[PDB]
Structure formats: C-alpha cells, structure tokens
Amino acid sequence: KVEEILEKALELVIPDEEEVRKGREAEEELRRRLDELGVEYVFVGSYARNTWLKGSLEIDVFLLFPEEFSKEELRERGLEIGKAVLDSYEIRYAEHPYVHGVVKGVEVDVVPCYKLKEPKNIKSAVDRTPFHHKWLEGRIKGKENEVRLLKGFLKANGIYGAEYKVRGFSGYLCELLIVFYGSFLETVKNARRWTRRTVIDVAKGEVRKGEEFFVVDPVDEKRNVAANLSLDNLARFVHLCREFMEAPSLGFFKPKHPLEIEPERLRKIVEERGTAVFAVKFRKPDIVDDNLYPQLERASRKIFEFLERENFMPLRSAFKASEEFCYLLFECQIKEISRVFRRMGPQFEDERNVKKFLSRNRAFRPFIENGRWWAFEMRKFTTPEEGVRSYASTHWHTLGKNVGESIREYFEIISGEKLFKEPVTAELCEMMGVKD
RNA sequence: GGCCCGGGGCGGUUCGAUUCCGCCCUGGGCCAUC
Q1: Is A248 helix (H, G, I), strand (E, B) or coil?
Q2: Is strand B less than 7 A from the beta carbon of A133?
Q3: A18 beta carbon to strand B: under 7 Å
Q4: How many other C-beta atoms can be found within 10 angstroms of the C-beta atom of residue A221?
Q5: Which nucleotide is at minimal CA–C1' distance from A127?
C-alpha cells in the first residue's frame, strides 16, 4: 500500500550516510576557506535545506555584494574568490558568468549576486534566489523527505527539470508544493484535480481558476514558479498521480529501463503501419542545450506544419540530439500523392476575377462546380521526403537561428533501413507508441 | 537563443493577401542558465 511503498521509496531518494557525510565535510572546508578570506556569503538551494535528491549532491555558495557595486565588479571579485577557494575551478555561464568547481570531492557553484532588502530592486533571477531561500528555510523544515520523494517521482518519470530539455517541475516548485499540501502523498492526491486553468497561491494558501497553470511565487506575486512547465508535462503528471493512487508501486520512483529494440522489428512495424518514416539529419550546432532544443522544436514544428498544409497528413514529429548530429523525425499517412490537385477559383458571377483565373495557361482546362470555378494544378513534389528536401533547402532560415544555419550548410533526408541504422530507434518507438 | 504582443518597410504565392509562405530593420513583455 502507498505507505509501505513510500517507505521502500525513501531508500531511493534520501542520500545515504556517506553521501551526506561527504557533503558536510565539503561544506565544512568550503566554509573555512571562505572565512579565511572574510567573504560575505550564504549557502542556498537544496543542499542548504537538505532537500537534495540522492546522487545529486551539489552546493550553492552565493556571494553577497553591495547594491552600488557595478555588474563587472561582481563577476571579477566573484571569479577571484571562487578561484582561490575551489580546488579546481571552471568559469561557467548564465545571465552573467559564475564559477563552478569541486571541494573535497563535491560539486560547487559560486554565484555572484547583490545583497538586497525586499524583493523589488531585484536585478537578476539569481538575486531572487536568496529571498526564495529565506522564505523556504523556515517552512520546509521537517518535510525534506517529502520534497525528495516528490523529486524522485518526477525525476523517475522524465519530468524533473525546469530547463528546456525537460520543461517539467523545478526543484523550487517542488518545495513550494510540499509546503502547500504538506507532503508527497497529499500533493499526489490533489494534483489529480489539477486542470490547465489551476492556480496555486502558496502565500494565500488558496487555489483558484486562472487562465493557465500558475503557481504564484511567494516572493513575487507576478512570477509563475511553474512558468516553463509544458501543458503536456502537466497532463502527464496529473495522470501519473491518478495511476499511482490507483495502484501504488515502487516502480514509479525507479527510472524506467532504456528497452532497446532490434532494428529489424522496427522495420516490420513501420510496414505494419504502411506510413512514411523519414529523418532530417544535419550537424549539431555547438550550443548549450537551453538554446538547441527550443530550436529543435521550432524546426520540427515548422516542418510538421509544412507537411500538413501540403496534404501529407503528418501523425507525430520528434527529435534527437547527439555529440555528432541532430535528427528531425517524422511519420506521415501519405507516402505519395497525385500530381494534380484542385485549386479554388472565383464564383461564376464575378466576371472580373473569373476572367483572370481563366487567363492562366494550365494543362487541364478548369471547370465549374457548385457555383464557383475550379482548376486542376500540378504539384511540385509528390512524396513527403521530396517536399521536405525542398522546404529545408529554401526555408532554412526559419528553423531557428542556429539549427537553421547548420541546415543551410548541410542536411540530408534518411529513410528505410538506412534510417533504422541511425541512433534514433528509441525515439521512433516512443513516437509510434510502439509498446513492449 | 525560444515563446507572447506590437510597429516600419518588402519578396514569393493567389482570381483575390492586412489575412497564406517567408525576409529585412524595429518597440515591449516572458522563459531557461543558479
């Protein structure tokens, strides 16, 4: 039963004694170093609140700087401090650069920010974190394991990140939720009633109907904590909660198995479907995933839209990325279509336009049907692939800034066996609902 | 970078385009980076 299950579960979410110990002693040292320099700092994030998921140990040391300090100063002093304190560093990037390193074996993020008073004055997302922490530390105390359960559950099902490769629940949203419902289970139970118009005002302990799923930030009533949660990911969670409660099981916290498929069986199935399955391959632009995937979606969407207005009847689109290349995957109901198609002309009494419409030299002689004129025109292409080869070659600039630029210099359309031999077999099966 | 809203020019397509497909400059808002 749920309880017995959640019990066996804490085991997969809570960091064991050694992963914890490792943490403390790393924070211990990290503390000394920072003081033997008299720097004004503050640990934030899931480490400072013991809400960190097992296996995801990382520390977040935020450096407080006067308001008056310039942007440049912040990062320079931040770069210096980070460098001196970290065993081994690495200048990372975001809204502004910050430093990432390791201390006594554990991960560390040394972010520079402005010491501020009261939410307004907020100069960057990072400035807001300190407030999020002060508001969260006193209220989440004693429920950390509820937070963890809720992450292992979301992480296990592929919707734990808030970044563009996940579009799911952010760890912050997770604690706010636990602070609202009181525990994992209560969150799971209530989530089942969530709709796309549900709004959760943590500060008001109230739930209301809005225009979109909105979890108003305690620190900023205008900020949506679940802003980048995809409408489909929300749907998948609402369902996942409904099923968990129907049949509790430790399997919900266990990362689903990769489940490889033999390319041969994939071939058979596509045949059983008798659809057009092809891919658009091009070199992976060298850019962070936060810029790459929002592009892959656009590109994939722009082509899907080309395919349907072109009468190829697309079923679903998808995409995969590698160290090497990127793939846009499509499946259609039409492997081929006739050359001729019917073009709609003016009504019979509009002498002006009628004449014009008839003034074009076509090959088949237009006709009248139910009051208006029509014409038989020929298509430029007759198969999905044939069309996308044309679309990608001329409309490359609309598939994203980067993706669009790598397609402009090189792209190929694969299909048949050649396609099943590309590292995209898994994605396809997920796209076709192939079950097993 | 991506999404939402808006201005100013254009190109292709169409009997017919503000309205479909796209391109230039361009104002504001939001999202991820912790």
Answers
A1: coil
A2: no
A3: no
A4: 11
A5: B34
Q: CA at A121, C1' at B29: how many angstroms apart?
A: 18
- The CATH architecture annotation of domain A1-14+143-258 reads Orthogonal Bundle (1.10)
Give all strands of the β-sheet with A412-415 in edge-to-edge order.
A314-321, A325-332, A276-283, A412-415
Resolution of the coordinates in A? Answer: 3.0
User: Which residue's structure tokens are 């969530």?
Assistant: A194
DSSP state, residue A88: B
Report the half-sphere exposure of A407 (CA within 13 A, side-chain side). 29
Experimental technique used? Answer: X-ray
Tokens coding A95: 């809204």
Give break positions in chain A: residue before each, C–N beyond 2.5 Å: none
Scan residues 309-338 of chain A and list those with Cβ within 7 Å of strand B: 309
Nucleotide nearest to A346 (CA to C1'): B15
Rounded CA separation A271/A275 (Å): 7
CATH superfamily of A339-382: Archaeal tRNA CCA-adding enzyme catalytic domain (3.30.70.1550)
Instruction: Read off φ and ψ for residue A159, nearest 5 degrees.
Output: -125, 45
Buried b (16+ CB within 10 A) or exposed e, A181-206: bebbbebbbbbbebeeebbbbbeeee
Fold of A259-338+383-436: Alpha-Beta Plaits (3.30.70)
Assign A227 to helix, strand or coil.
Answer: coil
In this complex, the answer to whether residue A170 has its CB under 7 A from any atom of chain B, a nucleic strand, is yes
| Pairing verdict, β A214-216 and A198-201 | parallel
